Structures are given as C-alpha cells and as structure tokens.
C-alpha cells in the first residue's frame, strides 16, 4: 500500500469512466444536482502479477483495504460522494479493474439567459493529486461512459453524456493534478410553461387592453390595477424560483417590458379621464383610438426585438 | 468468501422476497416514495452444507462477515438502502436464509395525466451484478413477497404488491446483470379534492357568469377580474404541488380552458359595454341573452369532450 | 453470542419498559412525531451467572459487543431508532437489565374527522423475532414504562401513556413475532383557533351579510367578491395544514357550508338588482329583507345540525 | 473502566462547566435553538493518582477509551450530542480534567406573552445516571461556565449564561439521577418590527377611518373592505412565525381587535348608507361625527387597557 | 501518541493555509454559507526525522493514526467540518506536510445596512489548544492561502480571500489558545434588483399619483389603496428573504418611507373629496395641483438625503 513503481519515469495512467445509473434533483435556484453512478477506475500495478497457467485462476479478486487503490475525488460535490465498492479485479499483468457505485450532489452553475427555452452542459470533474513516489494522470475509457436509457430527470431531456478524454494537467500547491471533464447535456421542456405561465399572462395582459374600448375611468382604473396585480403575483411566482443572475434573463427582459407596457396603459387611460372633464373628448378619442394599434404593435414587435436579442 | 463455485456452469440462482412494513412520504413534485421492509434473500452454496447427525443442529446460524452473501442493490434509489441483517440461516444442504430489514427513499415516475382521478404502479428493481468466478441470477419466492395489511399509503390506495418473476437479464460493463421488478399498485384518494378544489372553483366560474344578468360595466369588470384572479390563486395552490410534465393533464386542461371562459366573458362584457354607450342596447341585449345558454353549454360540452379524451 | 438455552422449552421472556423523556414534532401533514425515551429491556441468560464471592462484583456490567442482546426494533419508525446504551448490568442468577436512550421520527396516523377539536392516540409498536433456535416473547415491565412531567407537545395536551401488557404473536416469513403496543394518548389545544381562524372567518361572513341592507348592486358584488377571496385564503391556509383524507372532517365542512352561503348571497345579489331594473324593486325589497332572516338562522341551523353529526 | 471506588460511601461529585462558543437558529414556531459549546467535566479517581516527584510528569493525558468517563447526557435535546474530546489531564492525586467541544439542537419552551416585547430563559439540563458500584451527582464549576463574547443570537440580545448549581436529585427507574440546569437569559431586539408590522399595519387601520369623512357608500365598501384584507394578510404573515399557544399573546389580543374595529366600520358604513336612503342624512351625518372620535379615542383606550394587562 | 517535545522552550509552531476548492450556499437570513476547500499544515516533528542515504527515500508517508497530527478546529461552524486526509508526508528533517479537504457551514454576521448594494467580510477562524507539555501556536503559510479561480458564490463577486498572518493568542479554560482570521472579501450583484424590485416598486408608486390628475374619490381610492396593496406584496417579498436587524437598513428606510408616501396621498384624496362635496373645489384645486409637484420633488429630495445618510 504505496504507488506501483515506474518502470522509467512514465507517470501512472488511470482510466476512468462514470455510467449514470440516476440522475434527479435539479435545483435551478442552487444550480445543484444529484447522481447516482458506477465510478470505473484501472491502472496497472505489477506488483500484483501472476502466471495464469500455474496459479490456475484467470482474474484475482480483492478488498479494498489490500492493495493501492488511487485516490480519485469530484471537484464539484457539496460533500465527498457516497460510495460502495462493487468489485476489484486484478489480471496477471497486473491491470486492476475497480468499480464502484456511488451518489453525489453536484454543483454546476446553469446560463438562465434563454428560460424556459435554455439547454445546459452539466459537469463531473474527476481529478487525482499527485504523491511524491510518482505522477498520477487521467485518462478517458470510452467503452466504461454511459448512461442507464431509463434515466430520467423531470421537466428535462437528456441529450448526452460525453466525456473530454484529454485532462487538464495542472500544479496545486506544489503538485501535479489531473481533472477530468464529464458533461452531461440536458435541454428544458418548456411545454408546460406554456399553458401553465405564458398564455395566463398574456390575456390578463389583453384584457388591460379592453380599457381602450372604454370611457368609464373608474372601470379602466380598475382593470388595468387589478391585471398589474396579476402580472406582480406572475413575477414573484417566476423569480422565486430561479436565481438572482447578474444578466439579464429573456423571461427577464419580457416580464420587465410587460411594467412598461402597464405603465403607459395608465398614462393614457389618466390623460383619455383628464381631457374628457376638460371637455375635449375629440382629442381623448383620437388618443384612444390610437392606442388600439399602438399598443398591440409596439408588443408584438418589442417581442420579435426581445426574441431577436437572445436567440 | 467467495461465490459458491458451479456444480457444471449453471448459474447461481438468488431467490428474493420483499414484504413491506411501512409505506409513505409520496412526494408527487419529486416522483419519490420512501419504504420500510424486509429484504428476503436464498441461494445455495454447498460449501456451507453439513450433516445435521453429526453437527447436533438442523441450521447453522452465520454472521454476515462469515459466510459469502450476493451483493443485491436496488436500482431507482437516491442513495444506498439502510439495512440491518436480521438473520442468516444454513439448512443441513447449504440453503442460506438471509433476512435483512432496509430503508430506502425510491425514484418511481409517476402518469399525471389523469390526476387528481389517477392511478399509479410504483417500482421497486432488484439488481445483482455476475462476479469473474460465476454468474448470479435473481429469481422471485412469491410465499416471501408481500405486505403488512397495517401498510398505508396517506391519500393513496393500495392496490397490490406483485413481483415480475421472470428477470431482466442483460450485459453491463462487459458483466452479467439481472434485474427484478417490484410492483407496488396504488390508486388516489380523490374525495377530498371535489369539496375543495373542484366544486370552489366551479362556483367561483358560475359567479362570473352573473355579468350576464346585469347592464353595470363597472360591476360586470369587478365581477369577471375578481373571480378571474381566484381562478389564478387556484391555478398556482393547484400547480406548485404537481411536476412540470411536458404532457397535458386533465386538471391543466380544465385550468386552461377556464382561463379562455374567463377571456370571452372580459370579451362579451366589452362588447355589451361599448354598444350601450354607441346606444344600440337591443344588440347588447341579444347578445347577453345567448350568453346565459352558449356559456353553461359551450363549457358543459367541452368538459363532457376533456373526460373523454383523458378518460 | 447466540440466543440463551430453555430450561424446559419455554419460550425467552424480554421484560421491556418506555420512559418519554422528549416528545415533539407532531407533524399532523406526515402523521409523524418524534420521541426522545428510555428503552429498558430485562431477560435471563443463565450463561453470564458469577459468584460474586470469586468475581468480588455484586453486579457485572458489560458493553452491547460482549453479550447477548435480543434484537427489539421498532415496526413504525420511518428509519431505524438512533440508540445509545446507558447501561448494561448483570445480577449473580444471570438476569441482564438492559437501558439505552433514543431518538425516533414514529409513524402514527392521525383521525382529522373532530380537527381542530380532536383527541389522538399515538403508537409505537416494539417487535422482535423469534430465531431457530428458541422463541423470543415481549413482555411489558409496568414499573419501567412512564413519562417525564416536563414532556411537552406544542399545541397538545399528554394525558396518558400505558402499554397493552399482551403482546400480539404472530407469524411472520415463518417465524414468531411478539409485537407490542405502547399508546400516547393526546388532545389538541384548539383556544388559538378561535381568535385566529374561528372568529376572523365568521366575521367576514357576516360582513358579506351587510349586502342585505344596501340596494348598490356595484357595492354588494364588492362586499360578497371580498369577502369571497378572503375565505378562499382562509381555506387554503387551513388545508394546506392537514393532510388529503378519504373522509369529511368538521373544518372542512364547516368550510364547504360557507361556500354554499356565498354562492347563494351572490344569486340574491344579482336576483335583487335584476328586478331593481326591471321597474319591480316591491319583489327585490321583500326577497332581500327575508334574506336578512333566512341567511343567519339557516346558517345557525346548518351549523346545530353539522356539530351535531360529528359530535 | 468501572467507576472510582468511594473511600467512605460518599457520592461522586462530577464537577461541570458549559462555554459557549456559538449560538445560533433559534426556532420560535419549534422552540429550539442550535448549540456549539465546551462541555468540562472534573472528577477524582484515586487509581490514576500518581508521584509527581517519582513519574517526573506533573499532568498525565490520557485517550477517552483508556479511563472510566461519566455518561453525562442533556435531558432537553433532539438527538444526542455530537461531540469530539479536546483533552484528558490527570493531576499526581487522580483528579480527571475533561473537555470536550459540542453541537446539539435544544429543546427549550418559549413564553410569546408578551411578544415581540418578550424575554426569555433558555435551558440545558446535563444529567447523570448512578451506576450499582456508587452514587454520581452533578456539581457546577463557576469558573468554567461562559460564553465568547462574539456569541450572537441573530435578532436577540444575550443577557446572561448561568447555572443553578444545586442539582435536582431524584430517583428515576430505581437509580439515582443528578440534574443541573444551565439558564440563558436572551431578550428579543423589537426594533425591527416597529418599520415592518406595526407602523404599516396602524396605517392600513388608519386609512380605513378616513371613510368617516366620505358619503360615497361605494367607496367607504372600498375602503373599508380592502384595508381588511392587508390586515388578514398582516394576521397570516405574524402567526406563520409562531407557535400555536394554549394562551393569549400581546400581539394575538391586538390583531384580535383590530378584527372588531373592522367589523363596527362595516356596520357604521352600512348605518350610515341606510340613513342616507331612508331621507335621513342628519342621523347619519350625526353618527359619522361621532365615529371620528369614538374610533380613534376608544382604539387608544383599548390599547392602554391591552398594554397594561400584559406588561 | 505526544506533542514534539519543544529543543529550548519555543512554542510549537503549525503553519497553516486554507485554498477554496468551492464556495456556495450564503443564506442571508441564517448568515451562514458552506466553504469546500484544502487545509493545509506543516510543524517540525523531531522524533519523524531520518537520514535520507541509509532510507534511500527523500520523503517518508505515514498514515494519521501512526505520528502526532495538531488539533486544528474552526470555531465559526456550525458543526465540526468533515475532513478527508489527502496526504501526510515527512521531509528528513521531520518536517511533516499535512493536507486535508474539508467542507464545513460557517458563521458570519452581516451588515444589512447598505443592502442590495453591501460588500461583504465572511471569516474563517482557525483555533488550536495548547497542551500542558507546550503551547502551539498558529502562522499563516501565504504561498499555501487561495482559491481556484472557478469558485463562484451565486449572487456576489469574490474580490479577496486573505489571513491576517499574527495569531490572536489568549486563555480559555486555563490553556493558552492560538486563533487565525481567514478573510473572504465579497460584494453583490445588485444588478438583478434593479429590473425585478426596485423599478416595478417605482412604477406602482407613479400609478399612485395619477390620483393627482383625478377628480373621482372612487377611481383615487382604488388607484391608492391597490398600489398600496402592491406596496405591501413588496414589503412582504422583500423583508421575508432577510433577517431581523436591530438597526436601520437602506430598503428598511426606503420600504418605509414609501409608506408614508401612501398615507399622505390618502390624506390629500381625501381632503381633495371632502372639499368637493363642501362646494368649494377651487381649494381642492390648488392643493391637488400643488401635490403634483410636491410629491415627486419631496420623494426625489428624500431619496437624496436617504441615499447620503447610507452611503
Ligand atoms: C410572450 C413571449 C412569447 C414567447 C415566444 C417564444 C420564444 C422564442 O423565441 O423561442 C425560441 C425557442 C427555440 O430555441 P432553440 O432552438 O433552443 O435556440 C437555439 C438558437 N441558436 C440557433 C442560436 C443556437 O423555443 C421554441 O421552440 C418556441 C416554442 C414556444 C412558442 C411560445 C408561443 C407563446
Ligand atoms: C370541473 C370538472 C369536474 C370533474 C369531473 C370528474 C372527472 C372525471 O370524469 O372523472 C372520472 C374518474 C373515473 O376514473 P377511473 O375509473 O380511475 O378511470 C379508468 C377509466 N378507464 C379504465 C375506463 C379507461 O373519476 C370519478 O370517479 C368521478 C368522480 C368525480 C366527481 C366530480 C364532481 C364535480
Ligand atoms: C364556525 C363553527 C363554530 C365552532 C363551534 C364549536 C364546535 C363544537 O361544538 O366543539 C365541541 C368541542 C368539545 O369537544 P370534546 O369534548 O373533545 O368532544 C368529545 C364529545 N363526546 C365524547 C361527547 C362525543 O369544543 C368545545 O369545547 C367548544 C368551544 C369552542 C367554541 C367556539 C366558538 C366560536
Ligand atoms: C399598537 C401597539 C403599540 C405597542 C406599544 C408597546 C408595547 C408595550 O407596552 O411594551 C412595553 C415593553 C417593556 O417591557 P419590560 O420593561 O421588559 O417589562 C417588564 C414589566 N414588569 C414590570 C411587569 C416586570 O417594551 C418597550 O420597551 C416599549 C418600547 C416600544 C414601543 C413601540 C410603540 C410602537
Ligand atoms: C428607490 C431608490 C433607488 C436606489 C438608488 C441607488 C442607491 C445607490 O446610490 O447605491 C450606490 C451603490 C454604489 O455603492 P458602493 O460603491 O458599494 O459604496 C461605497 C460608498 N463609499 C464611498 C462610502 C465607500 O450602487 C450603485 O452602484 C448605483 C446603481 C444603482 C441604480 C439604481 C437605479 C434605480
Ligand atoms: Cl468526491
Ligand atoms: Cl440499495
Ligand atoms: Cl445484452
Ligand atoms: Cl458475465
Ligand atoms: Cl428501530
Ligand atoms: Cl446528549
Ligand atoms: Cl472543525
Ligand atoms: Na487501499
Ligand atoms: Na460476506
Ligand atoms: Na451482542
Ligand atoms: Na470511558
Ligand atoms: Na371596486
Ligand atoms: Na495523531
């Protein structure tokens, strides 16, 4: 229990691979997520050589606690993960062939820029610290990344699970350090959102607007208070669960628009009430009118702008 | 400890067994289902038999360190089961009987698309991985499968407990995995959604529909949007205790639909409005009378068309 | 370390005894409590006898690894109680007095039928199974199982906790089961939901009521929409606080009733205005001073009736 | 490891100190609080007693595992502590210096009597059983009881940590237990909700006494109706941050008023409009006047009354 | 194992370093964050010390358990941190290098009073005891004390993390006690509360003020007393995500102020109707046209002279 030595000076390779068994718990506010996964790691320790002819058993099996094993951490976990050893094998050349099984919660920061349309790269990084006895680097084995088909993480669609294969070689106080990048890309399922947030929110948008059909102030006072109402409840419900980004988000910049949009709604039914007491209602009809186009013109092309910007 | 070697190169046969203690914690939101029961597990290894004349005893009883047990794990749990062997027994042929008593919070999927009238079928899959030396294969012991009558689901219905006795036998890393699947049906307890979400909401819609008996814009506009932001309160208690499924369910379907009742009623109320002032309130007035039949019609024939497709 | 040897064949009696020494977190939503108590647990293992002539102890103590212990669990706990061992003494003949102290989150459901007027019986069942070799049986030692006077349940009145002396033996995967029921029997305080949710909702009932007294149609759909929404809070803050039951319960009758009321003031509300403009107030005057009699005895009436059925 | 031998029959004194390193989570709705502290424990045990002249050392240290340690526990806690021993020193004549370093949730009852105006004393009660051999009693060193003065209870003001230091020694399932009672006196920082609940509150009040001043029924109806609703959602947001108490609180008996000053508006609001339709504005202009000092004089006089009976 | 025994009398001196592998999780309310990262450490162990030629290693390995390891603590968390040894290595001389990854939640007060716009000092305390053999006593390795360049606190900028390199030495229970103040500089990302608070709070205070071109005491009221509501929403929304501070903060201030603003805007509502029905609107007139200017210059100078008191 000690490095395997190196036969010149070459550092000493240890192939890993992460098979997602489960994958839940996405928190858009903590930008956290949890796995569950089988962990592969091989590398080749001669000392634990064997003749297969005469020992007459083809693989040894062994406890942890017997051999060298590396060891490997994710960068990213909230806590050191969970794991169970399933199994240890050792080949007569030496190669040993460790499994695990284990969970983790894992921290990836999410681009909240295109909600509820966004897609994200989720990230696993594995790295392992160097021992003065000798080098430890990372390395990718295709053949032990995947993923179970029945792994599913609700309101998302998992896209890929892929793996950078040249690690990052890198010096941390005083000593060589490989990482390695698993990415695991996922796109929202932004139907819900639809019937759920979008269509509400735009009739009680539209229905502010049935004020420039009116010449009853109290009525419009009324219906466009009690819609901007409406829309402040839609903004709370929305914000409180994403995080306080230090950009500017679409459902962002839209819900932002919409205040505007309610603001100059109450400007034009104040000054349409002002000039009919001041017995000029040709002028207030003529603004009223206009506004019947005005409004919804300047919305949907604010939007195609808005769209525009962020995709 | 290792696995009982094959008589010729059959492979090894791990008889299962769960009966449930308790069952509870059905988060709808997370698709979780926490557990407490028995883990039963049988599997021959004649290395453990003895001849119960000499020996005194007709069973051997072992400590878990002792004697090789299969490494059995469940697959759609968050973390590692919490166990507790209860006992291991070995009959005079080598018929290990292990009992184990485990914890577990379980990933089970849930089909909202007829909720709150829904019916579920939780899993729990049973999963042992083959080891160099030879190949492990669950099986089902039905006399050892099944629940507590004391067992209660809160809001929930427990159908049956049933397992899939013929396993999912498949390759994994280059290893034999066999799978079991374990059947827990349940059914939703709707009652009490009826006198508190159904029939509220359906008397705060009816309400609405009294601006079809009266001429007063100001008191039709407060009648529509004061029910209408209801229907949204309603709306959001009903949604924040539901997943974003990307299907359509029938308790959103019937949300949305009344927000497009709520719409046409702010449309006819407009309409009603602007031909009183325009003095043509025999229009007005014929429209308001179809109102009061095409409304209750139009939304009794459009649930009648929902039910039928959801149902 | 294996189960004492009978005399005759009498089965192994395990006296057991709980002192509460915390009780708190009565969850009524999870139908969950958790408990801080003493276990206490005496057998006779013949195999641990001394003199103590030759020992020169009167009494032996020994750590849980030594000796024997049977193995108690607890049926409803969500996971395994946290247990740590005060002490472990024993007497010249063998006898093994057995305390430990533990913590434990106990699954009791609860009948919300009388809420917020209920009274509750709380269980924790104690179980142990019987091995191959002899049967284990549970006993309840009455001068060990008690309560702490300090033991305090926030917003609930302790008046007893007993045992049922008889335990239920039974059969479970082929072996006994001794089963023991300890009962918690409490009763909820309910004076905060009279000046908190009692009141305020009757109050705001009756002010919808003063609708009776105005002919403003405008004015009235104002007083009885209001009024409306804040009952709607005041249901939502209610049931989000109790689970879904399968059942009626009083509050939620109570609250269903009232709904109803509302209903009916909003039909006599639009009845009154309706014949107002139909040049017929003589109809409206006589319907609305009824209602003014009508609407309080009937409620009066329906609530004699609705305390009556559940009390 | 058994405990030091007495050299008459007297009880063996454990001397004790609690420090408090942190403070913090201080749960009204739980009435619990989290606890980071030195535990120090001192007692003789003669076997350990060595030459200071002959062992060259003048303090030995020791392992917990190597010497009899008293089981001191706190009766008023969640779960058992979860504590790691800073250090073990022997002095020549066998008296045992113990430390070690503590977390706990404690269980400690709050009075909201006079709340947010309220004090309280916060208790840890350490507790010792006596074993066979002899009598443990608990004991305070005053010189080892404190707190860092960095110590902060987030929105309290810590006044004094202090123990009773005569134990409570009664009997408890046939064994003596010794009981001490540390007390942290904290008094509650109300500035807070000066700017927050009660001014805010005071106006929405304030404001609907504005309608003695106004004979627009429809907007008095506004007025009136709104405002109570700002104070239901008042009531919710203060009684969501308590616990439900069998007794009346300062704050309970204030919102309960106000509900009554809501409820007499309503009447006179609805009087005077009677008033006014049956041709008799003089009455009702003579009871508006007097609303406009009955109200504000008999709120102040309510108020006095309140104050006076909980402080 | 003992502590180093010391060559004169020179205290024992462990040099210390912390690097931040992850930072997250700061709860403002708890005023609390989670810190992942290394901490490393270096003393001089005589006794480990070896010749180099005769080992033939030029560093030696050693477990935890087999040499003397300082007990290092962090006085501000919650719990003690969870620690995982990355390795322990012995230079010739007997200088051990000691590394460990840890994660602990820590406790750091914070200044609300410039909040969204506030900079922030969060602190690491290191601590070790002295022993009666020698006093230890922290240094601070500043080549070993940094933080990847990928940490990201959700929300805030990190601008410094830094240790204030001469140790706070003092006596706490008669041993000498060796502290050090790590320090993590941050400031947050205010820009987010500008589009979702503090604009939207604006706006609602503008529609307020149309009030000021109105004449109609029904349109006023609703258009104040519902921006109100809004207001109050607000209020609610933002003091629920902050803790209870007993001094002033700059959005307690201006929250508050706005209230105000509200009250005297009813006031004027008011006073502008009574004056209406007196039959004297000239009055009315002119302190509604005053208004106009009155209140946005007064709220403008308010802002100025709040802004200058904080900042
Ligand atoms: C109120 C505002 C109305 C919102 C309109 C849709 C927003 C948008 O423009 O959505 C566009 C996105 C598509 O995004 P994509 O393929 O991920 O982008 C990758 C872009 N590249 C090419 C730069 C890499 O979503 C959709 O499929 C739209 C379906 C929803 C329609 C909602 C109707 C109501
Ligand atoms: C607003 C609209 C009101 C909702 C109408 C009921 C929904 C429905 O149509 O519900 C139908 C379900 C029955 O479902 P089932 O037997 O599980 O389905 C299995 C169907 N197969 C196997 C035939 C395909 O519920 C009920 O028993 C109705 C009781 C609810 C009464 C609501 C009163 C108002
Ligand atoms: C709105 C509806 C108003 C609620 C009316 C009280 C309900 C009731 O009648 O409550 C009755 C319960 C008594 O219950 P008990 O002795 O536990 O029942 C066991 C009964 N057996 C054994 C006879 C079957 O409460 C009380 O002491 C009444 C005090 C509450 C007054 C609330 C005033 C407002
Ligand atoms: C609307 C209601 C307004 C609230 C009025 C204050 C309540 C009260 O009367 O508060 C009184 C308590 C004083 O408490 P004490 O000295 O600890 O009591 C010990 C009493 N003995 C003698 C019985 C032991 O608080 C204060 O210092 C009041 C300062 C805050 C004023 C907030 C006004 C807004
Ligand atoms: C309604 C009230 C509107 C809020 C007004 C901004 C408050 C302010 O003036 O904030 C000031 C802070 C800057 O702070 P600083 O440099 O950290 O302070 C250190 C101060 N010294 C000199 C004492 C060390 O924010 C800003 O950068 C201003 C951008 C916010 C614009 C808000 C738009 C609306
Ligand atoms: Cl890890
Ligand atoms: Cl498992
Ligand atoms: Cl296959
Ligand atoms: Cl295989
Ligand atoms: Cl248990
Ligand atoms: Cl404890
Ligand atoms: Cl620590
Ligand atoms: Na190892
Ligand atoms: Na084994
Ligand atoms: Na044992
Ligand atoms: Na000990
Ligand atoms: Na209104
Ligand atoms: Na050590």
New interface residues.
């Given amino acids: 229990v000690?490095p395997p030595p190196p036969i010149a000076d070459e550092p000493l390779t240890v192939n890993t691979?992460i098979?997602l068994?489960?994958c839940?718990?996405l928190d858009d506010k903590?930008?956290t997520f949890?796995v569950?996964a089988?962990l592969?790691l091989s590398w080749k320790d001669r000392r634990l050589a064997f003749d297969p002819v005469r020992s007459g058993v083809?693989?040894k099996?062994y406890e942890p606690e017997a051999i060298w094993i590396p060891?490997i951490?994710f960068?990213?976990?909230?806590?050191?993960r969970?794991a169970?050893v399933?199994?240890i094998?050792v080949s007569p050349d030496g190669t040993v062939q460790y499994?695990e099984?284990f969970?983790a919660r894992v921290?990836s920061?999410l681009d909240f820029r295109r909600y509820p349309f966004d897609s994200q790269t989720l990230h696993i990084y594995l790295i392992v610290?160097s021992?003065?006895?000798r080098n430890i680097v990372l390395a990718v084995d295709l053949?032990?990344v995947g993923k179970?088909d029945?792994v599913?993480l609700?309101?998302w669609d998992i896209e890929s699970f892929t793996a950078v294969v040249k690690p990052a070689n890198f010096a941390?106080?005083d000593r060589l350090e490989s990482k390695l990048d698993y990415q695991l890309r996922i796109s929202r399922?932004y139907?819900?959102?639809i019937?759920?947030i979008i269509?509400?929110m735009l009739?009680?948008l539209?229905?502010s607007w049935?004020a420039f059909?009116?010449?009853?102030?109290?009525?419009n006072?009324?219906?466009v208070?009690?819609?901007?109402?409406?829309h402040?409840?839609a903004?709370?419900?929305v914000?409180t669960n994403l995080?306080?980004?230090?950009?500017?988000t679409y459902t962002?910049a839209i819900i932002?628009m919409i205040?505007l949009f309610?603001?100059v709604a109450?400007?034009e039914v104040?000054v349409q009430?002002?000039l009919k007491?001041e017995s000029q209602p040709a002028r207030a009809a003529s603004i009223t009118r206009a506004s019947r186009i005005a409004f919804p013109v300047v919305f949907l092309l604010a939007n195609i702008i808005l769209a525009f910007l962020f995709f």
Same sequence: chains 1, 2, 3, 4, 5.
């Fill in positions: 000690s691979g098979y068994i489960e839940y718990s903590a930008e949890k569950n089988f592969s083809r693989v099996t060891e951490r960068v990213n976990v909230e806590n050191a969970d169970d399933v199994d094998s499994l099984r969970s921290l920061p610290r021992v003065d006895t053949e032990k179970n029945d599913f609700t309101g941390l106080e399922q139907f819900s959102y019937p759920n269509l509400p009739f009680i539209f229905i049935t059909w009116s010449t009853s102030y109290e009525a006072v009324t219906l208070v009690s819609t901007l109402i409406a402040i409840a903004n709370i419900l914000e995080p306080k980004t230090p950009y500017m962002g932002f205040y309610y603001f109450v400007i104040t009430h002002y007491v």
